[PDB]
A paper describes a structure:
Crescentin is a coiled coil protein that is required for the crescent cell shape of bacteria such as Caulobacter crescentus. Crescentin shares biochemical and cytoskeletal properties with intermediate filament (IF) proteins, which form the third major class of cytoskeletal proteins in eukaryotes. To better understand the relationship between crescentin and IF proteins, and the filaments they form, we have determined the three-dimensional structure of crescentin filaments by cryo-EM. This revealed the full-length structure of the parallel coiled coil dimer of crescentin and how dimers come together laterally and longitudinally, to form a non-polar, octameric filament.
Among the MBs, megabody 13 (MB13), a derivative of nanobody 13 (NB13) binds to both CreSwt and CreSsat at pH 8. Cryo-EM analysis revealed that for both versions of CreS, purified CreS-MB13 complex at pH 8 polymerizes into regular, unbundled filaments upon lowering the pH to 6.5 in the presence of detergents, such as CHAPS. For cryo-EM structure determination of CreS, we treated nodes as single particles, using a box size of ~420 Å (henceforth referred to as “small box”), to obtain well-resolved reconstructions of CreS bound with NB13 molecules. Because the megabody bound close to the C terminus of crescentin and all N- and C-terminal ends in the crescentin filament are located in close proximity, this enabled us to obtain a reliable structure of that part at close to 3.3 Å resolution. The resulting atomic models of CreSsat and NB13 allowed for interpretation of CreSwt maps, determined at lower resolutions (4.36 Å to 5.78 Å). The atomic structure of CreSwt resembles that of CreSsat, with only minor differences in regions near and following the stutter. The structures of the WT and SAT versions are very similar, except that the SAT version is slightly longer because the helices contain one almost complete extra helical turn.
Author numbering:
A (entry chain D), B (entry chain C): 1 to 13, 789 to 887
C (entry chain B), D (entry chain A): 367 to 443
E (entry chain F): 96 to 154
F (entry chain E): 96 to 163
The structure:
Amino acid sequence: EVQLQESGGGLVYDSLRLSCASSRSIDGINIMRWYRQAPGKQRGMVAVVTGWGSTNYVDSVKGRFIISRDSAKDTVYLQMNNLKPEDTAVYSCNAIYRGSEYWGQGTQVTVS
Amino acid sequence: EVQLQESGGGLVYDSLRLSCASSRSIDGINIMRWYRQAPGKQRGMVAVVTGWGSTNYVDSVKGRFIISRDSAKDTVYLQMNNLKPEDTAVYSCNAIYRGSEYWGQGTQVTVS
Amino acid sequence: LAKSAVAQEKALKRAEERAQQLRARLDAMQEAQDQVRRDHEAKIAELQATIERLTSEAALAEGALEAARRDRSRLQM
Amino acid sequence: LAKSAVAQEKALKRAEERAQQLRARLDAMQEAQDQVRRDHEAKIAELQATIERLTSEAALAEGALEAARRDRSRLQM
Amino acid sequence: QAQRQIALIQAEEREVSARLAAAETALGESDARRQTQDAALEDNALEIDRLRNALLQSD
Amino acid sequence: QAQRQIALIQAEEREVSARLAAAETALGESDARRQTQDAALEDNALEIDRLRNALLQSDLKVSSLDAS
């Protein structure tokens, strides 16, 4: 089995950060992605990184999020600035190993 | 650029096929797939196969529509069996080489 | 015929060192296949799975999430 | 002893072709790697490319299924 | 055209390496034997020089 | 890169007129001198035998005469 670990919760009126680390199967990573969950609602992708580190997102955050990787430490990062109180949701990083998916605990990001 | 000069459909009530031929690149086949669409709406896929014999289907075309490979000719076999009334639609095959996707015609299948 | 007999005796002893000296490079660089390419074959299989699941995950994500959604937004009717 | 050079002439000759023959296989194995080393450069890209704009469709296709999904809550509830 | 210049570079170097390999082994041992054959033949070159005196003393 | 493979070709052609030729020019040296000593060995053997045998031919008088 493989494991994940989330992080990055916080509130403001604006400075914020998120992180999702892993302790095992380090860098053995093909496509892995990021999600957000609206309370009591469904779940969907928000941002992704891959083997070559190509950049592409969901349309809601074009010009809003910047995402970057470290191959070694296994903790991908995202740039959250200029927030709008309507972006709040429940976030949970994603990763697929050997073709099988693996979710983690899950956290939320709120601004209000 | 490929020339997926697809054909094989029909306009009847008993046993049909969707065969998308080739023009170049005999099994230069990375991910390649099919799409359908119902009038007044945008597009949608039906079944997708990948060069590794792995095949998966959307829920609807299970048990009645079958997709299979034939590398000796580079002509994906998507058999249309047990044509139920809902199966009326407009179809078109697909492929992706060099990154730049390519498309063709497809035909109109109407069975009631 | 002492110097001629001795000459061939020391003559052969170097070409038999080349016999090892040329099967030394051969043994090494031949091992450069048995592990470098053989694992290089595995990474293709490892990367191969992700093209099996992004199709499976999008199999539900493209059809089912649109067989009913655009049906639900038929409020125009 | 008189003929003993004749026998030792052939080892001075046979070891020469074992030098001649063996280097030929060393000639071949070099391009048996280099030409393949050009094949496993295109395969990764041609395989990784057909993924690098597959996530760009796994997401933008959900853009229609999230930017328009915010409307159903106005009337469903 | 990159493959054109390359096509010769493995082609030429292999021909180059062949003449680096062949000439080096061609010259070396034949040089070693030549100096010995000089030593082999010039030491008993005095052998006639010694005996020509030995012939003339008694004759 | 392709031009630095182009740069090599001239220097590669410089190396053959260089060490490549030095080896070739040395080849003519050995075989020329080899034939000098090789042919001499026959002649030096020819010069030895006439007086090595004459040694036996002429000395034989040392013992036969002493009978007298």
